[PDB]
Design a protein around this ligand. Structure first.
Ligand SMILES: Nc1ncnc2c1ncn2[C@@H]1O[C@H](COP(=O)(O)O)[C@@H](O)[C@H]1O
Ligand SMILES: Nc1ncnc2c1ncn2[C@@H]1O[C@H](COP(=O)(O)O)[C@@H](O)[C@H]1O
Ligand SMILES: OC[C@H]1O[C@](O)(CO)[C@@H](O)[C@@H]1O
Ligand SMILES: OC[C@H]1O[C@](O)(CO)[C@@H](O)[C@@H]1O
Lengths: 124, 124
């Protein structure tokens, strides 16, 4: 696709938001329904590598996305987490925030992925 | 102290950074050495409640603090996480980021707390 996420290209079909500096995508394997990712467009490996503007944008974007997924996927809270570094569990070497809708007491095809990204693009 | 964190006052002695809109403090019970918190100065309960500027500042501040604690406490990575909402585990109703230094294979007195905050104020 047209979005770079580490060492693989992400098809726009699975991207549901894109800003001046960041973008959001749905997962192949969500851990929880609505588990989405907000990444800087520039593929940097560690958080300290982002310029301040990328940082403000990374998180103002994460704020908008969280509202949307909490809403759509019917959660009552949200967990945000960034595994920054190999000893923190980062599998893909690209800064990214995990946004997961939370609710009391708690793999798919590219098409299920794009169906969901289509849905999410509506809230923006 | 002079910092508000939910429904209790935090003594400045345990605060090691303060910006135009945010502040960082050390914990009574760190989960991992160097486990610190970055909160908006304005006590808001959920992340969606922050204005965009508070958001940029919350995270540009978290970026600086992470560099410092990763350095001082000898970690090789960092875990960042915000439990946003009661179903996400938020015990204190004040937006806040948990910053934890990570390293391969992984309660105290107000004085141990201020000793550590003194140390951290040096890196700024
Ligand atoms: N190319 C990709 N497309 C969609 N999700 C991905 C991709 N690569 C990794 N992920 C997911 O992003 C996270 C990285 O680990 C997990 O949630 C992965 O399953
Ligand atoms: N007043 C306080 N001073 C210092 N750490 C606190 C305070 N209240 C809560 N915490 C810690 O902040 C987190 C909130 O839960 C845990 O890491 C708490 O132990
Ligand atoms: O997956 C979340 C979406 O699916 C439903 O539960 C059923 O279609 C919706 O109303 C919600 O928005
Ligand atoms: O607690 C972290 C700090 O403690 C030491 O391991 C011993 O004093 C330091 O060199 C480090 O900066």
């Amino acid at each position: 696709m047209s979005f770079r996420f580490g060492q693989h290209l992400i098809k726009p079909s699975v991207v549901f938001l894109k800003t001046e500096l960041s973008f959001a995508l749905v997962n192949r394997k969500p851990v929880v329904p609505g588990h989405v990712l907000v990444c800087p467009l520039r593929p940097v490996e560690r958080f300290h590598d982002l310029r301040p503007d990328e940082v403000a944008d990374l998180f103002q974007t994460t704020q908008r996305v969280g509202t949307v997924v909490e809403k759509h996927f019917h959660g009552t809270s949200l967990t945000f987490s960034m595994q920054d570094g190999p000893e923190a569990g980062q599998t893909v070497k690209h800064v990214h925030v995990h946004v997961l809708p939370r609710k009391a007491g708690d793999w798919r095809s590219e098409e299920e992925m794009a169906a969901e990204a289509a849905a999410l693009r509506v809230y923006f």
